[PDB]
Subunit: 251 residues, 4 copies
């Protein structure tokens, strides 16, 4: 199943879409700078692009910086949308945040550690917006339908599934390349995407991204952490593999 | 390090404390009848006991009953304390719930999926009450220290760690019996309790084996979410008496 | 099901048996010294004891001591049996090793990784001796029935199942305490023992907590390679004694 | 590092090589038919191809057919080599087997469970033959160098590393796509190949094969859906040709 996001078609059998950007919003100026580089690079490559950022990092240390918060963050997003004419994605943590975020941000994201906060799921669903579901590391590819079931029960079917690795012993993540196919089969062929950045915690990034896309995915999710100047060389290679894979009929 | 909860001494060198009750609070009459059974068996064997329930928890399904809520829950708790003169324990999900819940409930529980949530940790710490931290399944015993550090900076030292199991491949949980010892060394020998029920996802034969294994490592308490109970508690008590009556190994 | 090993009764509801000795044999002299130590300790605690050692060490680096080897090793075992009148256990890696080893050793052991190899299974089974089957670290407890089933097909049912941990990510082992029960329920309550030594990889304390957690499930025996051994055993016995006096539910 | 297996060039930066054939050698005519189809498809696509089978692999049951054996096995290989002019690969389990096998076979294989038995590594090393080393499922990728060092000490540097998955909970395997990179960096960029058949435990095989070869590999290892092979190799070749044509970043 495909999902229109303004002009972009996101589907497992459509050219891959890049979800990319910073980790958290810090300034209007820093955000515009990084997004211009993301846009300028993606536009020349002809890769549909969606800008990602967090307005709050609620898992941060007690005395560390957490973000600009919701109010100013949304304004930053309005300006990004205005200047580049692209869709944006951000994560939501509290039910009450869902509607005000949804009016600005085309894609709202459910954090992996929160997949089972029922109230948040319902408030995200009410919005009618496109949802990105981060698969928790402790969840098997086929249990992913349980969360998909919940959004359908809440009346929203415009969902993307996001792989970010599976828990492997202590303090380590493996990505089961077969998971992508299982999520596709059990969840009605909703768009699946690969968060390669988070899957890497604990050259490598490229191998992983490439392997993931070989299985035939809707999109690639990343933070930049990756350098730029390498973002272009990096994506050139992804585009080349994605083109090839997508040009071959399924089966 | 010992924690006085009213007249109960909870600590890894103290007779084990049973934590048990119901999943979600329905009514006063339903709560009293179930608590009564627990209180009868525990008193019959002289086992210190703490009643457990949720006033408001997210569930398996969207429209599953979350519980009577804060206001009616606290009244139910107050009567249970009045009735049986025992400590109670409940979970909190929102910073705002912490202060009024802490007025009634001797121990407050941090849900596993919210463990890294700084705002909630602060709110729970600021209460000054005994806090139970539920260990996420995708977390290693060595990184529980980080959650423990967060509580100390926020000014609360009165903490219980609660083992619930670790991810073991897909759709499985294993309890690493070495984990218990690692939490003691690395976190100042805080009270550790073993949540046997959620560790298990006949099955009573199995709950026993697991419970006995845990308690052989020498632990502050036992955590259930389940006459059949008596014969069970007889065996835990036997083992806990034997273990707690021997000095820890000599340096 | 109980197994008579000479005068020792090994079974999931009998007093636990200690298995232990040295990693690998080097000389008659230091071997007799270690064995004497174990017999001294277990005797005064009243714990049955089977002495364990390898004669070969085949995964070692090429330039390293691999051990005394088979002809010499059995000679040391013969003299260990003569000196102390105890049973012994050792491991075999090649089908031809089996029979000569079985002449001397009461229990012969199938290394976990060789559990696959049917030839060795067959050769081990034809000796008639008591076999210790280590559980491969990637195998589920319930899959032990298949190997047990192989030994029954080869005509030997005097089998002890041995737990040594499971693979847990890279370079790590966890011991799943429910495994013991699953194994006891699926393999007809054959003796189950616990190799805590290899289940591991301050600390000597990790061994006790592990042994204690394991023995609390109710097991036939245990493996263990100023007085740390007796300090350990005193506690293990107290636990085993308590657990084995409870009726089975 | 490039390995010349006869006229074939095998390396992480060469066009991928296909290791393919049957599980166990059962008969002469049957073997030649399967190999005929593999050769037919591969020559048709210009993929270098090496034939694979065992003559003695232990099986799930103790009495299931292990294979034709060493004597007849080597004769069947002689016959495949004569008829098709292609190289062959087989596995070996005993030190004494290494020599008779290496005289006929172009690549000898060390089965994963045996991968740390030094006697066998040394006997393999001493042949001077090309060696395929299966990674054991319970070993981490950065521990391969230890096996690689053992081979070097014994005087053989012409080694292939073969991925077949890692233990992931009970009775389940996962392929860590980062394992290939780690092996390249730590073992001197030796040829790495991917055994998807044993990695599984289909559309899956294809997906796994493609993910695998996306990371840039010397070859692909598989057993036999025997006619969808052409359609399958069409896709693998496509991806491999694309990847291989770009320089390493």
């Amino acid at each position: 199943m495909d999902i229109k996001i303004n002009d972009i078609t996101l589907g497992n059998n459509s050219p891959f879409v890049l979800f990319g950007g910073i980790n958290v919003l810090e300034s209007l100026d820093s955000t515009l700078q990084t997004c211009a580089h993301y846009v300028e690079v993606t536009r020349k490559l002809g890769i549909p692009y969606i800008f990602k950022a967090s307005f709050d990092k609620p898992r941060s240390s007690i005395h560390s910086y957490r973000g600009v918060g919701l109010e100013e963050g949304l304004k930053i997003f309005e300006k990004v949308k205005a200047e580049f004419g692209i869709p944006v994605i951000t994560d939501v943590h509290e039910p009450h945040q869902c509607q005000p975020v949804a009016e600005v941000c085309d894609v709202i994201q459910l954090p992996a550690f929160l997949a089972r906060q029922t109230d948040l799921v319902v408030a995200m669903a009410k919005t009618g917006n496109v949802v990105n579901i981060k698969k928790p590391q402790f969840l098997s590819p086929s249990q992913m339908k349980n969360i998909v079931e919940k959004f359908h029960e809440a009346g929203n079917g415009k969902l993307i599934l996001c792989e970010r690795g599976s828990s492997f012993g202590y303090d380590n993540l493996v990505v089961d390349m077969l998971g992508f196919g299982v999520m596709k089969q059990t969840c009605g062929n909703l768009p699946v995407i690969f968060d390669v950045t988070h899957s890497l915690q604990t050259a490598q990034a490229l191998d992983l991204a490439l392997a993931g896309m070989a299985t035939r995915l809707a999109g690639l999710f990343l933070e930049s952490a990756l350098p730029l100047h390498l973002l272009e060389d990096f994506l050139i290679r992804i585009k080349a593999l994605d083109d090839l894979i997508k040009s071959q009929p399924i089966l």
